[PDB]
Design a protein around this motif. Structure first.
Motif, PDB file in Angstrom:
ATOM      1  N   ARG B   2     -19.122  87.005 -22.064  1.00 38.36           N
ATOM      2  CA  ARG B   2     -19.934  86.629 -23.273  1.00 38.36           C
ATOM      3  C   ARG B   2     -21.243  87.198 -23.548  1.00 38.36           C
ATOM      4  O   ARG B   2     -21.920  87.465 -24.248  1.00 38.36           O
ATOM      5  N   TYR B   3     -21.697  87.448 -22.102  1.00 42.89           N
ATOM      6  CA  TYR B   3     -23.329  87.971 -21.968  1.00 42.89           C
ATOM      7  C   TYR B   3     -23.104  89.515 -21.975  1.00 42.89           C
ATOM      8  O   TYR B   3     -24.383  90.076 -21.748  1.00 42.89           O
ATOM      9  N   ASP B   4     -22.157  90.197 -21.863  1.00 45.52           N
ATOM     10  CA  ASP B   4     -21.946  91.613 -21.796  1.00 45.52           C
ATOM     11  C   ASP B   4     -22.890  92.257 -23.072  1.00 45.52           C
ATOM     12  O   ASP B   4     -22.895  91.777 -23.961  1.00 45.52           O
ATOM     13  N   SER B   5     -23.384  93.403 -22.422  1.00 47.24           N
ATOM     14  CA  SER B   5     -24.678  94.258 -23.274  1.00 47.24           C
ATOM     15  C   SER B   5     -23.962  95.221 -24.049  1.00 47.24           C
ATOM     16  O   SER B   5     -24.801  95.847 -24.893  1.00 47.24           O
TER      17      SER B   5
ATOM     18  N   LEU C   5     -27.963  93.077 -17.384  1.00 39.43           N
ATOM     19  CA  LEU C   5     -28.449  92.118 -18.043  1.00 39.43           C
ATOM     20  C   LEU C   5     -29.925  92.586 -18.888  1.00 39.43           C
ATOM     21  O   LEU C   5     -30.330  91.816 -19.739  1.00 39.43           O
ATOM     22  N   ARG C 123     -32.110  89.976 -12.496  1.00 36.15           N
ATOM     23  CA  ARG C 123     -33.143  90.058 -13.402  1.00 36.15           C
ATOM     24  C   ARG C 123     -34.341  90.715 -12.601  1.00 36.15           C
ATOM     25  O   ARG C 123     -34.412  90.355 -11.374  1.00 36.15           O
TER      26      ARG C 123
END
Lengths: 208, 240, 227, 212, 231, 233, 211, 195, 232
Positions: B2-5, C5, C123
């Motif tokens: 769901r957080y894949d870029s 990310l 991060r």
């Protein structure tokens, strides 16, 4: 194992002058000379030299590794490497293969830089095949002819000396040492490095 | 998931949308120049001003050396540039170890572009946002000059400019550059290009850096101009 | 399951690195000065209540016998980076048998920060390091960033209101400043930035005194300097 | 300094006819000079028309037979048809060659009846080589017995010659051969099993030999 | 929006359904089995005239006794063919006998469904007809991306497969002779095909019980069969 | 991401990633290939900034093996990495078989690798379309064409890149069998210039035979372009 | 243990014995030392029987794979190279396989010698096994190109006979195959060497033959 | 066991090797072609020792060098070739010994005509002439006696003829047939000699 | 709503939607029915026929002597499970020289189901198995996409299972203490009721496994005789 491709390297210190000499034989099966130009002294830095003696393949491999590492360090730091750092890295590299090691007995010779004007101090050291560093501050020898070189240097060393006297003494000691060894010799080469310049000469040695 | 870029994935028109952003970031960096002359290759650049308390002595942030015969200029993110410069040094020294000879520049640029392309295709990691101007000299071909990008695209050049306002610098280069040029004349042209691109009539000795590589006496060597040398050069420029 | 990310946005700007810079800008300020015969790193710790023991929390650390470091950001990231820097110096010394050069250490730390802002599943660091040291090639004062790009300074500040502090520091600074004058200037800049009243246990200072080991001032010495 | 190989001794004989095959085997398990037990069959039934006998390490032969039976069962489950004797022979060859560097200490004979009602007999070696033959013997008594079978079947070095052979005569000859092997060998055994494979299934009988 | 292996509210995997939709386009092929042997034929949809017509083959051979005809994504089909022939030759090495067609289809389906972990990354989107002969007889099978393979007596794949199979059920009858099967297959292929049937416009292959060897009809055999087909 | 599918079927049954890669291919430079008797002609366009770019840098047309040759259109970096892979495979084949790799084998290998990068997770499709020309194991000339989707086909004359349809249509109505070398080069230049601005700096044509790949001299290209320009007007 | 092969006008002639020994004792008198690797390529067996047989069949499987995939018959050179590579991978493991691969390909008639140490050699006359020296001596003394098929088979049979005569490890039956353009034929499937000796050297059965 | 000879001089290089394939106590062939390996361009590698080992190593080195030349679109320098071969040989020596003696030779626009000796332990070093195998003991001295600066190709072939006669007359394994590879004037020529 | 995108997310009510969809796929399959008595276990099923030119697909399967299963759902998952069970039984018999305990095998397959259900990036098998065997006593087991198994006296799968279940519950008491022939008849009744349009020797599969009766499908002639008996 060291008889196969025997060799001899020597080094002496003087007054603001250093010298490193080596034999120029490459043989096979001990009693068969194959080439008479194999030089054991390799320039690693403008004022740092390494003389390697032993198996030729091991000599070449170690020289290439050292060149790689030294070039990397010099480029990263954008400055010349110090003899202390080179000696320590050589010890570390030799120990890295304590088991299945490199069958080579190198010696490091050069100038230590004392900034403040600037000063040059002779620096010498000899190693075992594991990296058994041992500073001596005077003549250093290494090779199958270690005993003869030790005797000659002990008899002839004159403490600090002019570069001409240093060249004479080192050349005589090396020529005497080689003449008593059968698997080493076939020409000799001498380097006299000083801050101002560097002289390289080849002796009229007993080529047989 | 769901957080894949969505990093390594073609755009509806085939651009991946990430190389484009990296390039657009490149265009915002300070300008870098590159010239090839009869005596050497130049990579004049423009220093970004952060404050008046930076160490003027040394502190070269745009031009680096990869080997005795190779030296390049950065026009993007500094951290990515540093890691890629490190990789370039490892590659050159590994080649020297393998073949007992200095690596031709083409091989080095090919390897750098290969690693950039690998980062652009495999995995989901973002691409390197840096573009170089690798220049050097070798016996096989002689003085050369290339230009990479985040997509691993490289091409030779005789005279070029990258970074912000690269268009005007390239126009000036095309207007003035000549086939056979002296090293001093090349330095003067580089100063002119840096002044025009920077929108400054007279460049400031503290706002630019220059360097050049020459095979003098059969031994290739690089020179990085200092404050006094660049001051004399600008004095000559304003004289003309 | 391992993806980046942090990614380029339209115009790039690496938004995560911008947020890390914002995190840094809101932390306690810390500054550094490069003098004629020494280097200083100073910082201010918020007035602690009677329960905290300042001897248990330290914003000034030493990596080697000659190199000191200060930070402004997340304490945990600072601790892990400090341990990694110590390990890096140790492994350098194990090979070259000498104190790690300041530029080399700065390069390793910058490379590590770069890898952390590139690798997937992580991060960026939320601190801005500040490394001072002395070596054969004189004195050095470098500043790392979350972006992983280092700068070579001679007098700088980081943290809250760093622009005004930088302007003040520039106003009163010289290339030939003495070490004691540099300490006085650091104290003055910190006092100006604090917006309150300073005293012992409210600031921390570390200095590399010529060819002497890096030393962190005790509270008595800081009090004596304050008078 | 331990050697993982011991010969448990024994004998297996195999003969073929026009449309039948006979396989006899001892039933003695023994050590260097002492006997573990008086009954340990060496012939394992692989399919309804194919059996295997072996000589050598008892554990190795047991494991090999069990593994081959498992492979055959999996094959019949996955392909819905029993494998032929040729297929089983090739599969056993592959299995044996799998351990080319830690080979089984087992000499193998594979007897069966092809789909055309032909008695087929494959003899192997400890590493995997196998070759079809009309008569074979493995184990301790192999050397003592092979010449007798060669004289009986091949019948070379003879001028009158006689090829009229039937099932009963072949069985009697096999019994005589195994009795002679027991007489002239010490690892042979005391009780022997005789399997006969014919177009109509297979049968097993037992015979009593000397105990020494 | 979702992974490759997400169930739908009705229990059907989305990716498998999309692959089923994809395989509905391509060159038309037909296949028939009779007591004498198996026959396969393909539309041979030739593109522009600059192609050799030899490189573009829709009828490969998994083994000496097995032939196939594909439809859908060609690259995935070639990958499947390579895997199938590798496994068939592995079977021949492990067992002297030749692999049964059913086993080959099982291996192909297993590879096709490998994409679901329980390596590849998505359904192959290929539909295959595999015809051959073994000791059990001559037979042909149909394989689809969902993994469910089914034996067939007379089948068709590719675009217009609906009309082809309708004609097959309308005409195909048991006890048919090999010549009858050939003429029937070519008639159906002609009917469903868009252009005018010709020697270079179609390709055929057949496996006989007597020979048990894959044999691809050449131009001469194709023309001979064409002359006799009813008008 | 790492090891997870990036190309997946759409609701209509299309691999959108493969289609986008094909679109990217359509954006690249043009290329043409002809064969006849026992030799082939390869042509590729060129686009360089005058007075600044170094023409020697461009390598749109390359040699893979002793005899094989390749041209491509699309992403240049992808072309380079795929070319390196193909050369490594050529040498691996020459190791394991002690014979030069035939053209058909290398075309099949390129198709296989392009398919593999389309059917594995964590990697996106190769955005290049290539065409190889070489000699079969029986000393016969053949040229193949491979696309991003992995489907490959042998051709007698084929063009790829921008407006490849127009060049293909032109070729379909002019190609002849067993032509002469000069006529083959003339046809190649005509086909490439059908869609490309007319100048001698926009083409770098070459001829492949059993001996070796030979680049046509610039003077010959200038004469040919002048001739075709005269014929056009 | 003896295998023989040579090349002549009408193709290639291959010959083998049939003895198999477990030391001083012969396990089997009839074995097949010639394998049809391909429709046009044969390979003999010498040394370790199991290793040779297994690797010949593995090479046959690989050849089938390649032929089916590429749609073209392989050349003897490629098969020899593949066999040599796979054998070399197991260097120093105990393999004792010595092979002669002979066959017809698009290049013509080819014959290669391979060893357990990756020793690939090309020629037109080879012999391996314990009786190799005798076969070589009998061939070279009388071998000649451009001789009829009957003479070739007679020479091969005589060479195998003489090899078996002075070798304990060679004997059994003589097998002679002929390789030509379209596959191969079995000129002599099996011939007992008994009558062969009593026909060649001692045609008259009186008194022991003394040598 | 396998005799190799090499003589380098201004504007010429010559390599010589006996043509024999020994298996046990017999010769498989009298025209062995597994000893010479010609690299694209002006480069030759002569190997001696076990047939399989030399085959593997020579094929590996030649095909790797061809890969390099094709990938980089240039010609590897002779020194680079020799040192790459030495490094590979040393690496395999450390892991999987290659009992093979090496004679590298070639011509370069930079260093001229050059030759390189290499022992089975990778004891490589540049040399003006050399030999490998037991026969070396019977030729090296001769090479010293008749060699002199400003030599010509014809004199080199005469010296090689003398060496061949010496091996035929005095060497235990009487070697008769030899193959010669002459590199000069940007040409590589192959000859066959029988003494 | 939005909690059915992954199999690792519990809905606000606490339900796994992916596993429920797998169960739905199981239910959508064809029919089947299993019964047992004092001795002998009878399994019957409808072999699906897609076209008049297609032989009906195999429905029942044999895992080992005295052990057989029936399928309902995705065929590929059924093949995987059948291979696993066959390998397990053969390995147990190989290395213990005895028949595998049925309950242990059912536990193993259920554990495989659970493992596939737990970890993300994997899907749950959309297939239901109907295991029937005789390990010193007749036994019938059912397995579900979620790790869960049960033991029954009469079972049915998917399709229009309502009619078959109603018939089974209406006659369950009579199954015990009933002859094998009558058991087969009752199983055929249940399948015919499920059919809801006739039974033929081609489209119906039948099998029996009981004491001194290894798993064996009923021959064509016997099946036709039974079909005629039920018809009249």
């Amino acid at each position: 194992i060291y008889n196969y491709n025997g060799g001899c390297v020597l080094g002496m210190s003087g007054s603001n002058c250093v010298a490193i000499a080596c034999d120029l034989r490459l043989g096979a099966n001990t009693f068969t000379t194959v080439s008479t130009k194999f030089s054991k002294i390799f320039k690693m830095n403008n004022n740092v030299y390494v003389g390697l003696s032993g198996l030729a393949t091991d000599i070449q491999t170690l020289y290439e590794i050292l060149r790689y590492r030294v070039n990397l360090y010099e480029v990263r730091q954008d400055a010349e490497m110090d003899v202390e750092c080179f000696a320590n890295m050589l010890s570390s590299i030799l120990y890295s293969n304590r088991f299945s090691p490199y069958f080579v007995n190198p010696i490091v010779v050069g100038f230590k830089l004392k900034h403040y004007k600037v000063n040059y101090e002779p620096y010498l050291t000899a190693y075992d095949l594991i990296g058994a560093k041992c500073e001596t501050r005077d003549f250093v020898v290494n090779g199958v002819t270690s005993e003869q070189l030790f005797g000659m240097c002990e008899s002839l060393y004159v403490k600090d000396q002019d570069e001409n006297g240093l060249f004479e003494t080192i050349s005589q000691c090396l020529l005497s040492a080689l003449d008593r060894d059968c698997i080493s010799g076939w020409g000799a080469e001498v380097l006299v490095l000083t801050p101002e310049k560097i002289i390289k000469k080849k002796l009229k040695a007993r080529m047989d | 998931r769901r957080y894949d870029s969505r990093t390594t994935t073609f755009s509806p028109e085939g651009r991946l949308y990430q190389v484009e952003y990296a390039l657009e970031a490149i265009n915002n960096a300070s300008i870098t120049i590159g010239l090839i002359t009869k005596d050497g290759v130049i990579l004049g650049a423009d220093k970004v001003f952060i404050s008046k308390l930076i160490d003027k002595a040394n502190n070269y942030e745009k031009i680096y050396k990869i080997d005795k015969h190779i030296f390049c200029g950065v026009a993007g993110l500094n951290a990515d540039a540093n890691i890629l410069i490190n990789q370039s040094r490892l590659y050159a020294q590994r080649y020297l170890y393998n073949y007992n000879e200095v690596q031709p520049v083409s091989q080095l640029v090919v390897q750098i572009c290969d690693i950039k392309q690998s980062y652009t295709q495999y995995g989901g990691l973002r691409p390197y946002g840096v573009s170089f101007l690798i220049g050097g000299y070798d016996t096989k071909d002689g003085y050369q000059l290339y230009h990479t990008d985040p997509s691993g695209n490289y091409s030779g050049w005789f005279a070029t400019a990258i970074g912000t306002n690269n268009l005007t610098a390239s126009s000036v280069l095309k207007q003035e550059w000549k086939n056979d040029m002296t090293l001093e004349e090349g330095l003067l042209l580089a100063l002119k290009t840096l002044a025009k691109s920077t929108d400054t009539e007279i460049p400031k000795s503290e706002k630019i850096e220059l360097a050049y590589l020459t095979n003098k006496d059969g031994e290739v060597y690089q020179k990085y101009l200092t404050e006094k040398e660049i001051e004399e050069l600008i004095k000559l420029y304003t004289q003309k | 399951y391992s993806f980046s990310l942090t990614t380029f946005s339209p115009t790039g700007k690496l938004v995560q690195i911008e947020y890390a810079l914002n995190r840094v800008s809101s932390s306690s300020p810390a500054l550094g000065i490069r003098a004629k015969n020494g280097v200083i790193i100073a910082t201010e710790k918020k007035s602690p209540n009677e329960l905290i023991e300042e001897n248990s929390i330290f914003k000034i650390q030493q990596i080697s016998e000659h190199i000191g470091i200060v930070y402004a950001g997340m304490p945990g990231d600072f601790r892990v980076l400090l341990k990694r820097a110590r390990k890096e110096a140790i492994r350098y010394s194990l090979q070259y048998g000498s104190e790690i050069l300041v530029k080399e250490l700065v390069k390793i730390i910058a490379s590590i920060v770069q890898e952390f802002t590139q690798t997937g599943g992580v991060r960026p660091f939320g601190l801005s390091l500040l490394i001072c040291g002395v070596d054969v090639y004189g004195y050095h004062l470098y500043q790392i960033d979350p972006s992983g790009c280092y700068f070579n300074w001679m007098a700088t500040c980081v943290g809250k209101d760093y622009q005004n502090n930088m302007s003040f520091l520039e106003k009163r600074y010289n290339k030939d400043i003495e070490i004691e004058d540099a300490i006085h200037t650091a104290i003055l800049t910190l006092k100006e930035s604090y917006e309150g009243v300073l005293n012992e246990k409210n600031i921390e200072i570390g200095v590399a005194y010529d060819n002497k080991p890096f030393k962190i001032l005790t509270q008595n010495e800081i009090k004596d300097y304050l008078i | 300094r331990w050697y993982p190989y011991i010969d448990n001794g024994g004998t297996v004989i195999g003969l073929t006819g026009k449309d039948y095959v006979i396989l006899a085997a001892d039933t003695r398990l023994s050590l260097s000079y002492s006997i573990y037990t008086r009954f340990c069959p060496k012939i394992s039934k692989l399919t309804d028309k194919c059996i295997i006998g072996s000589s050598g390490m008892q554990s190795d032969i047991k494991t090999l037979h069990s593994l081959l039976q498992k492979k055959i069962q999996l094959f019949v489950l996955e392909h819905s048809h029993y494998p032929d004797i040729h297929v089983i022979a090739r599969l056993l060859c592959v299995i044996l060659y799998s351990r080319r560097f830690f080979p089984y200490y087992a000499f193998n004979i594979l007897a069966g009846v092809d789909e055309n009602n032909k008695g087929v007999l494959y003899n192997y070696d400890s590493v995997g080589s196998y070759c079809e033959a009309t008569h074979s013997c493995v184990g301790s008594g192999s050397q003592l017995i092979l010449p007798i079978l060669d004289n009986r079947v091949e019948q070379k070095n003879q001028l009158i010659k006689n090829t009229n052979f039937n099932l009963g005569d072949d069985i009697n000859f096999v019994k005589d051969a195994i009795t002679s092997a027991t007489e002239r060998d010490i690892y042979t055994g005391d009780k022997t099993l005789i399997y006969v494979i014919d177009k109509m299934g297979i049968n097993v009988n037992t015979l009593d030999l000397k105990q020494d | 929006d979702r992974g490759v292996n997400t169930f739908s509210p009705e229990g059907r995997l989305f990716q498998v359904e999309y692959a089923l939709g994809a395989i509905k386009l391509g060159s038309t092929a037909v296949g028939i089995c009779v007591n004498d042997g198996v026959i396969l034929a393909s539309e041979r949809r030739i593109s522009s005239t600059l192609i050799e017509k030899d490189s573009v083959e829709k009828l490969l051979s998994i083994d000496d006794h097995i032939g196939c005809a594909m439809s859908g994504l060609m690259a995935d089909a070639r990958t499947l063919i390579d895997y199938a022939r590798v496994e068939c030759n592995h079977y021949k090495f492990i067992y002297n006998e030749n692999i049964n067609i059913k086993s080959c289809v099982e291996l192909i389906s297993e590879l096709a469904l490998d994409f679901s972990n329980l390596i590849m990354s998505r359904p192959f989107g290929v539909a295959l007809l595999i015809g051959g002969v073994d000791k059990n007889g001559p037979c042909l099978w149909y394989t689809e991306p969902s993994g469910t393979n089914t034996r067939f007596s007379a089948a068709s794949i590719g675009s217009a497969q609906e009309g082809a199979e309708l004609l097959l059920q309308e005409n195909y009858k048991k006890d048919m002779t090999f010549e009858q099967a050939e003429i029937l297959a070519l008639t159906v292929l002609r009917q469903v095909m868009e252009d005018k049937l010709s020697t270079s416009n179609v390709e055929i292959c057949a496996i006989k019980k007597s020979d048990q060897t894959f044999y691809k009809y050449n131009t001469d055999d194709i023309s001979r069969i064409i002359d006799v087909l009813p008008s | 991401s790492y090891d997870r599918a990036i190309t997946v079927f759409s609701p209509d049954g299309h691999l959108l990633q493969v289609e986008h890669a094909l679109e990217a291919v359509k954006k690249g430079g043009c290329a043409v290939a002809i064969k006849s008797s026992n030799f082939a002609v390869l042509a590729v366009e060129k686009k360089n900034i005058p007075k600044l770019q170094n023409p020697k840098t461009t390598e749109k047309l390359i040699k893979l093996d002793e005899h094989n040759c390749l041209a491509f259109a699309g992403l240049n970096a992808d072309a380079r990495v795929l070319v390196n892979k193909t050369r490594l495979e050529c040498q691996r084949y020459y190791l394991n078989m002690d014979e030069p790799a035939p053209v058909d084998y290398i075309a099949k290998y390129v198709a296989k690798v392009q398919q593999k990068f389309t059917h594995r997770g964590g990697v996106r499709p190769f955005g290049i379309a290539t065409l190889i020309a070489g000699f079969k194991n029986n000393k016969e000339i053949c040229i193949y064409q491979t696309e991003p989707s992995g489907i490959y086909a042998a051709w007698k004359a084929q063009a790829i890149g921008k407006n490849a349809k127009i060049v293909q249509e032109f070729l379909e109505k002019n190609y002849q069998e067993n032509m002469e070398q000069k006529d083959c080069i003339f046809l190649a230049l005509k086909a490439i210039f059908e869609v490309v601005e007319l100048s001698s700096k926009n083409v770098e044509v070459a001829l492949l035979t059993e001996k070796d790949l030979t680049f046509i001299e610039e003077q010959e290209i200038n004469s040919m372009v002048e001739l075709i320009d005269q014929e056009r007007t | 243990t003896t295998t023989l092969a040579f090349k002549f006008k009408d193709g290639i002639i291959v010959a083998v014995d049939s003895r198999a020994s477990m030391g001083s004792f012969i396990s089997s008198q009839n074995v097949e030392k010639i394998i049809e690797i391909n429709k046009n390529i044969l390979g003999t067996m010498a040394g370790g029987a199991a290793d040779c047989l297994y690797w010949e069949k593995y090479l046959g499987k690989i050849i089938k794979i390649y032929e089916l995939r590429n749609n073209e018959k392989i050349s003897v050179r490629a098969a020899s190279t593949i066999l040599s590579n796979i054998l070399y991978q197991y260097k120093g493991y105990g393999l004792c396989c010595g092979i002669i691969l002979s066959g017809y390909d698009h290049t013509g008639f080819n014959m290669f010698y391979v060893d357990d140490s990756g020793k690939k050699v090309e020629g037109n006359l080879f012999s391996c096994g314990s009786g190799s020296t005798y076969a070589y001596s009998i061939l070279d003394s009388a071998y000649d190109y451009n001789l009829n098929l009957d003479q070739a088979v007679e020479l091969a049979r005589n060479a195998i006979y003489h090899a078996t005569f002075r070798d304990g490890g060679s004997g059994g039956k003589v097998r002679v195959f002929h390789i030509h353009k379209n596959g191969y034929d079995k000129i002599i499937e099996g011939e007992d060497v008994f009558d062969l000796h009593y026909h060649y050297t001692n045609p008259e059965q009186k008194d022991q033959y003394v040598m | 066991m396998d005799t190799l000879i090499g003589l380098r001089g201004n504007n010429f290089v010559v390599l010589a090797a006996d043509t024999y394939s020994i298996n046990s106590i017999i010769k498989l062939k009298n025209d062995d072609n597994t000893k010479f390996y010609d690299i694209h361009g002006n480069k030759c590698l002569l190997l001696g020792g076990s047939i399989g080992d030399r085959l593997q190593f020579g094929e590996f080195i030649r095909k790797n060098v061809h890969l390099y030349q094709y990938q980089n679109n240039t010609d590897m320098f002779v020194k680079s070739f020799a040192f790459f071969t030495r490094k590979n040989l040393a690496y395999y020596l450390r892991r999987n010994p290659f009992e093979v003696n090496c004679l590298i030779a070639g011509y370069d626009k930079k260093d001229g005509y050059q030759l390189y000796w290499c022992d089975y332990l990778s004891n490589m070093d540049s040399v003006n002439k050399g030999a490998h195998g037991y026969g070396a003991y019977l030729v090296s001295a001769i090479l010293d006696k008749y060699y002199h600066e400003n030599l010509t190709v014809d004199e080199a072939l005469d010296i090689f003829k003398l060496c061949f006669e010496e091996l035929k007359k005095r060497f235990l394994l009487t070697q008769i047939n030899y193959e010669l590879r002459i590199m000069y004037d940007n040409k590589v020529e192959t000859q066959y000699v029988t003494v | 709503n939005l909690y059915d995108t992954d199999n690792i997310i519990y809905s606000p009510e606490g339900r796994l939607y992916q596993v429920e969809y797998a169960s739905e796929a199981i239910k959508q399959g064809t029919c089947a029915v299993a019964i047992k008595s004092k001795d002998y276990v009878v399994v019957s099923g409808l072999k699906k026929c897609i076209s008049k030119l297609s032989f009906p697909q195999e429905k029942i399967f044999k895992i080992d002597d005295y052990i057989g299963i029936s399928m309902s759902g995705i065929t590929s998952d059924a093949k995987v499970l059948t291979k696993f069970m066959q390998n397990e039984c053969l390995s147990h018999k190989f290395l213990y020289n005895e028949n595998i305990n049925i309950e242990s095998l059912v536990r193993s397959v259920a554990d495989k189901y659970q493992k596939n259900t737990q970890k993300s990036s994997k899907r749950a098998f959309g297939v239901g198995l109907m295991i029937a065997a005789y390990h010193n006593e007749p036994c019938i087991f059912e397995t579900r996409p979620n790790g869960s198994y049960f033991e029954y006296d009469a079972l049915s799968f998917g399709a229009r299972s309502h009619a078959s279940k109603t018939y089974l519950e209406k006659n369950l008491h009579l199954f015990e203490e009933c002859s094998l022939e009558e058991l087969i008849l009752h199983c055929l009744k249940a399948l015919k009721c499920s059919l809801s349009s006739e039974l033929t020797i081609s489209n119906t599969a039948l099998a029996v496994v009981g004491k001194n009766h290894p798993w064996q499908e009923i021959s064509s002639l016997q099946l036709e005789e039974y079909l005629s008996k039920v018809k009249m």
